[PDB]
Every structure is written in structure tokens, then in C-alpha cells.
């Protein structure tokens, strides 16, 4: 679970950095990490338009951010989990974090990181462990 938290922070930090934002400034607080970064890059490049849809259709504000996050993720996983959906999940949180900084709501960065790590640990971990853990992910997506 601490390794999962660290995976979430690695991904979010990477995605922020690609946009010129540092983790140390904007959060108030290894083979798997690399595979997830690459899968995230590939997913976002391949479906760029989906992420502009996200930032155009959903105007995040600190007061509605949690409810909106939970509604998206619950619908994403409504009928099950797979590796592709997990990648979409990480990319979604990455986009939310960058959007938050652009919009001067950077207090949400550490919150989104916490919501993702909670969801990952409580709801995604059971499936991930049942399917060969993250090393399997490295096999397919690394």
C-alpha cells in the first residue's frame, strides 16, 4: 500500500513535470514506475482529444472536485477492472492535477494524489493481486 502511494506520486509528478510544474512547488505535501509512465504517455498521445474533453466539459473547483472524481472513477470501473482501465485511471488523475495547477487550484494536487491512492489500494489492488500483481503489468506494458 505504501508502494501504491509511491506509484501514484511518481506518475503524477512525472505528468506535472512534462508541463513544467514541479512536485515540490505544487504538492503541499522502478520497473513498474517506468512501465506506467510509458503506458501513460502512449495512452494520452493516442487519445489526446479525450483529455481535452475532460478539461473542457468538467470545470473543476475545490468544492466539487472530490464528488466529480469519484463519479468518473466509479463509472469507469462500473462493470469491472482491467489493465487498460487502470492506465486510463492514472492518466485521468494526471490530467486533473495539471488542470488544477493551470487554474490556480494547486491545493487539489495532493488531494487528488490521496484520492487515487485510496481508490487504488481499496478497490483496484484486489484485482491487481488476483492478476499477477504489477509485475504482470510490466510484462504487457513495459
Amino acid at each position: 500500500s505504501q508502494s501504491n502511494r509511491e506509484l501514484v506520486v511518481d506518475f503524477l509528478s512525472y505528468k506535472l513535470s512534462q508541463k513544467g510544474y514541479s512536485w515540490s512547488q505544487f504538492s503541499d505535501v522502478a520497473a513498474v514506475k517506468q512501465a506506467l509512465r510509458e503506458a501513460g504517455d502512449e495512452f494520452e498521445l493516442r487519445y489526446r482529444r479525450a483529455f481535452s474533453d475532460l478539461t473542457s466539459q468538467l470545470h473543476i473547483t475545490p468544492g466539487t472536485a472530490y464528488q466529480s472524481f469519484e463519479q468518473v472513477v466509479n463509472e469507469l470501473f462500473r462493470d469491472g477492472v482491467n489493465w487498460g482501465r487502470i492506465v486510463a485511471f492514472f492518466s485521468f488523475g494526471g490530467a486533473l492535477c495539471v488542470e488544477s495547477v493551470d487554474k490556480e487550484m494547486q491545493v487539489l494536487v495532493s488531494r487528488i494524489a490521496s484520492w487515487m491512492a485510496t481508490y487504488l489500494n481499496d478497490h483496484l489492488e484486489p484485482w491487481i493481486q488476483e492478476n499477477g500483481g504489477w509485475d504482470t503489468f510490466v510484462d504487457l506494458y513495459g
Binding site: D53, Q71, E75, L76, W83, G84, R85, L140
Partner: peptide, 21 residues
């Protein structure tokens, strides 16, 4: 979100279908 989740889900599934063992 519903529509945003649907977009992400469908793309996650296409990604999954390609890479699944």
C-alpha cells in the same frame, strides 16, 4: 461525468484488448 467516464472506459478497453495476454 458519465460521458467522460464512458470515453475513458471505451479507450481503456481498446488499449486493454490490444495489450492483453
Amino acid at each position: 461525468x458519465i460521458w467522460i467516464a464512458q470515453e475513458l472506459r471505451s479507450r481503456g478497453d481498446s488499449f486493454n484488448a490490444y495489450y492483453a495476454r
